[PDB]
Design a protein around this nucleic acid. Sequence first.
RNA 1: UCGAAGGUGGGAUCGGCGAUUGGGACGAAGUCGUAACAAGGUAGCCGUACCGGAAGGUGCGGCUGGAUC
RNA 2: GCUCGUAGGUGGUUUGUCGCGUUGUUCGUGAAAUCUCACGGCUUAACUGUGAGCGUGCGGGCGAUACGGGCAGACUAGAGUACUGCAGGGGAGACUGGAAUUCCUGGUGUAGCGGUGGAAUGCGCAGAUAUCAGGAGGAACACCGGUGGCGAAGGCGGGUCUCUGGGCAGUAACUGACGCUGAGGAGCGAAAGCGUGGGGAGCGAACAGGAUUAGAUACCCUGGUAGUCCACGCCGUAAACGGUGGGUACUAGGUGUGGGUUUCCUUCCUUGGGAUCCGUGCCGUAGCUAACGCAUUAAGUACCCCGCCUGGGGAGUACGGCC
RNA 3: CAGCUUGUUGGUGGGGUGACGGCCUACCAAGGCGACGACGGGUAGCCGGCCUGAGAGGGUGUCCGGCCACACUGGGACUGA
RNA 4: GCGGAGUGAUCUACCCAUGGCCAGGGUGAAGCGCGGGUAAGACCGCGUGGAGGCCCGAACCCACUUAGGUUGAAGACUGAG
Lengths: 67, 31, 87
Amino acid sequence: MQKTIVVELEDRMRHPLYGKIIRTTKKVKAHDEDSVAGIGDRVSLMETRPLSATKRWRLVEILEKAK
Amino acid sequence: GSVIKKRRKRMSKKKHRKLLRRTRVQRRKLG
Amino acid sequence: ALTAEQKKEILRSYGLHETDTGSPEAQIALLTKRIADLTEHLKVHKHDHHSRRGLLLLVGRRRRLIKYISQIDVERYRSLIERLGLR
RNA sequence: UCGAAGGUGGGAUCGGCGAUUGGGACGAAGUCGUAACAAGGUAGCCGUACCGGAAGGUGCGGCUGGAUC
RNA sequence: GCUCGUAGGUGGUUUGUCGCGUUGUUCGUGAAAUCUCACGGCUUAACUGUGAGCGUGCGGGCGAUACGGGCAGACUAGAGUACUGCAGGGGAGACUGGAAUUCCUGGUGUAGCGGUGGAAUGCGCAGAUAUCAGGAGGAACACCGGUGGCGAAGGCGGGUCUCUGGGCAGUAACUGACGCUGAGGAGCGAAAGCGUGGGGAGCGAACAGGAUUAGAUACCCUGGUAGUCCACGCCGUAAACGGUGGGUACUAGGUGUGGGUUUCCUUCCUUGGGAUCCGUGCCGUAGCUAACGCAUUAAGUACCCCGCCUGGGGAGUACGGCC
RNA sequence: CAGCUUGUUGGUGGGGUGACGGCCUACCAAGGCGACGACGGGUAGCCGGCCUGAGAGGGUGUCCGGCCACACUGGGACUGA
RNA sequence: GCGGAGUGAUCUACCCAUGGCCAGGGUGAAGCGCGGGUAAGACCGCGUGGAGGCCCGAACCCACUUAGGUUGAAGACUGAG
Ligand SMILES: [Mg+2]
Ligand SMILES: [Mg+2]
Ligand SMILES: [Mg+2]
Ligand SMILES: [Mg+2]
Ligand SMILES: [Mg+2]
Ligand SMILES: [Mg+2]
Ligand SMILES: [Mg+2]
Ligand SMILES: [Mg+2]
Ligand SMILES: [Mg+2]
Ligand SMILES: [Mg+2]
Ligand SMILES: [Mg+2]
Ligand SMILES: [Mg+2]
Ligand SMILES: [Mg+2]
Ligand SMILES: [Mg+2]
Ligand SMILES: [Mg+2]
Ligand SMILES: [Mg+2]
Ligand SMILES: [Mg+2]
Ligand SMILES: [Mg+2]
Ligand SMILES: [Mg+2]
Ligand SMILES: [Mg+2]
Ligand SMILES: [Mg+2]
Ligand SMILES: [Mg+2]
Ligand SMILES: [Mg+2]
Ligand SMILES: [Mg+2]
Ligand SMILES: [Mg+2]
Ligand SMILES: [Mg+2]
Ligand SMILES: [Mg+2]
Ligand SMILES: [Mg+2]
Ligand SMILES: [Mg+2]
Ligand SMILES: [Mg+2]
Ligand SMILES: [Mg+2]
Ligand SMILES: [Mg+2]
Ligand SMILES: [Mg+2]
Ligand SMILES: [Mg+2]
Ligand SMILES: [Mg+2]
Ligand SMILES: [Mg+2]
Ligand SMILES: [Mg+2]
Ligand SMILES: [Mg+2]
Ligand SMILES: [Mg+2]
Ligand SMILES: [Mg+2]
Ligand SMILES: [Mg+2]
Ligand SMILES: [Mg+2]
Ligand SMILES: [Mg+2]
Ligand SMILES: [Mg+2]
Ligand SMILES: [Mg+2]
Ligand SMILES: [Mg+2]
Ligand SMILES: [Mg+2]
Ligand SMILES: [Mg+2]
Ligand SMILES: [Mg+2]
Ligand SMILES: [Mg+2]
Ligand SMILES: [Mg+2]
Ligand SMILES: [Mg+2]
Ligand SMILES: [Mg+2]
Ligand SMILES: [Mg+2]
Ligand SMILES: [Mg+2]
Ligand SMILES: [Mg+2]
Ligand SMILES: [Mg+2]
Ligand SMILES: [Mg+2]
Ligand SMILES: [Mg+2]
Ligand SMILES: [Mg+2]
Ligand SMILES: [Mg+2]
Ligand SMILES: [Mg+2]
Ligand SMILES: [Mg+2]
Ligand SMILES: [Mg+2]
Ligand SMILES: [Mg+2]
Ligand SMILES: [Mg+2]
């Protein structure tokens, strides 16, 4: 989808009453000034000003490329 | 006397099946 | 079914080094052979349910093994999938 | 152009009533039986099927939450 | 009901790293009021004010890596493969064996047979029952047979052949955590039942007659249709029960029985004694339990995951929906 | 309540805004959300607090205070920071 | 009306042999391919295909309604459906 990237975030947090550690994910959008990205691509991101309706993130650096 | 608990269920199920057999036709098939 | 001299001829062709018989690839190979022959056995004898359950057991085993190999290394996954047949 | 309201239409969905009809619960010193509890007088239950005013009966398989040697 | 398996949850031993969880400290925020502590004043109080906690949480920085988590690895102990053996009613298909029941044909032979608590209906005198020979057909497979074996469960035995699944033991050859469980889902799932087509001996819901009885829509008798059997689909339920979900570790023993392996009198044959693995029973200690009882096959001691319960009826019913 | 989404998901050039932004528009691609509950149905202002409780919890959101929404019902602009 | 013997299936009923005819639209069965789905299938989505006493509708074959005709144009028709 044309210079847009989707990063699936991760977070773990203490369950409020049963006290377990719940694993909760996200699916969020980040920018690509260059539209090169495979599937996988452990990458990092930081916030920006919105560039679309649900755009809030930007890719900063790509590491351990999709193998 | 644990069989009594089975007999109550038996009677209820028996009467329900008897009602269904009384109405397996447009008595109930329409509805 | 799958006598010794019948399993060796795919042990050399699918196992790694002249004695490998328990690697992911080897296990996929002979499970696939077993599933093939047992599917022939089930195309005849349509209603041999107790052996068809054994077939599903082998299928589940091979599915766990293919997911194992796809996690551990993906190039060998690709090679084994091309040289056996998937989907 | 967009536009609330309005109009037209076919659906969706939530309710009320409804001749008639079905079961449920609770009531009373009613009528017909006696099905279960003892081997409860044919051991009883489970599923299923058929039959019977009614409990129930019977068939098939099963259980012991029954017996016998 | 059982199993497989998706998401998820959970995960053996070890090395190094990250420091996300976790954890330490500080900074900031967590308004005021409220609540708590101490004083102060409204005559005390309620109420108020001031100072100190609360503000459990969150964001930044600086520490840590014991545990959890990510990553890069390693190991064989879990798991799986290989090899050698082993037991078995595990399954499917085809062919096939004998007893027995029924019927038919004939031989004999005559007045009963059958059945019951006692009878009658009924069968027979047109030749029944009985007996002999032959034949047709269907179903189930005596003795083996067990308390046993196998299968996830449901279930599974006449024999032979063909195909086929699982399980157990031993070697340590191989892989190297690939495991466990499993919401949903899928498959299998006694009997009854349903569809189509076959088959139909015996049995036998329904039905009919006889009997019993106050009645007898029953129990008993005489017949007897579906069904029971087969092929292929459907159904998806059972006291589908051990009324006990799966996995794993540990916690006296005693005694059977089933399948392996291994050491001592080893040729004293004894096919005794011991150890070990996997079953399968009984009895029993600790422990547990309301008690009954369970008790290394736990209902004990623990951990992981799932299913389920929250008084009895109404009701596993109505409505909706799916099949 | 299992399929919801077409200006919906993104991009480009524009427009527009105080400001980023499908906020709007022309074109291009066909994406985004969801079993961690989308979409839907019902109910409801939220909170520091208040009630209860040993606490965790359960109920509740009235005085005070903070935030939001509304102003007969529904739709829209103007001035002006 | 009865009987005997003949005549008739150039009408009509059925059948037999051999020919002919059915504008134009529409729908979209099996089958066959590709893809998804899983191990394999089921199954599903697309195409393709062109089935059917299939649909609409001329010719053609009928004859439902209605009006007309009813000393008819016609001893059974015409018009409109
Ligand atoms: Mg842009
Ligand atoms: Mg008692
Ligand atoms: Mg009424
Ligand atoms: Mg009684
Ligand atoms: Mg009874
Ligand atoms: Mg009696
Ligand atoms: Mg009785
Ligand atoms: Mg019964
Ligand atoms: Mg009866
Ligand atoms: Mg029985
Ligand atoms: Mg398993
Ligand atoms: Mg599983
Ligand atoms: Mg998983
Ligand atoms: Mg994990
Ligand atoms: Mg660990
Ligand atoms: Mg004072
Ligand atoms: Mg004071
Ligand atoms: Mg105060
Ligand atoms: Mg405060
Ligand atoms: Mg091992
Ligand atoms: Mg066998
Ligand atoms: Mg014989
Ligand atoms: Mg016969
Ligand atoms: Mg004779
Ligand atoms: Mg005879
Ligand atoms: Mg290795
Ligand atoms: Mg489930
Ligand atoms: Mg099934
Ligand atoms: Mg059956
Ligand atoms: Mg049948
Ligand atoms: Mg029937
Ligand atoms: Mg039949
Ligand atoms: Mg009888
Ligand atoms: Mg009778
Ligand atoms: Mg067969
Ligand atoms: Mg049940
Ligand atoms: Mg059973
Ligand atoms: Mg149960
Ligand atoms: Mg357990
Ligand atoms: Mg044992
Ligand atoms: Mg004991
Ligand atoms: Mg207990
Ligand atoms: Mg209740
Ligand atoms: Mg129901
Ligand atoms: Mg319904
Ligand atoms: Mg547009
Ligand atoms: Mg643009
Ligand atoms: Mg712009
Ligand atoms: Mg309101
Ligand atoms: Mg309390
Ligand atoms: Mg308020
Ligand atoms: Mg008020
Ligand atoms: Mg007013
Ligand atoms: Mg202005
Ligand atoms: Mg004449
Ligand atoms: Mg003639
Ligand atoms: Mg002619
Ligand atoms: Mg002629
Ligand atoms: Mg056409
Ligand atoms: Mg087609
Ligand atoms: Mg037609
Ligand atoms: Mg023509
Ligand atoms: Mg003509
Ligand atoms: Mg005609
Ligand atoms: Mg007329
Ligand atoms: Mg005409």
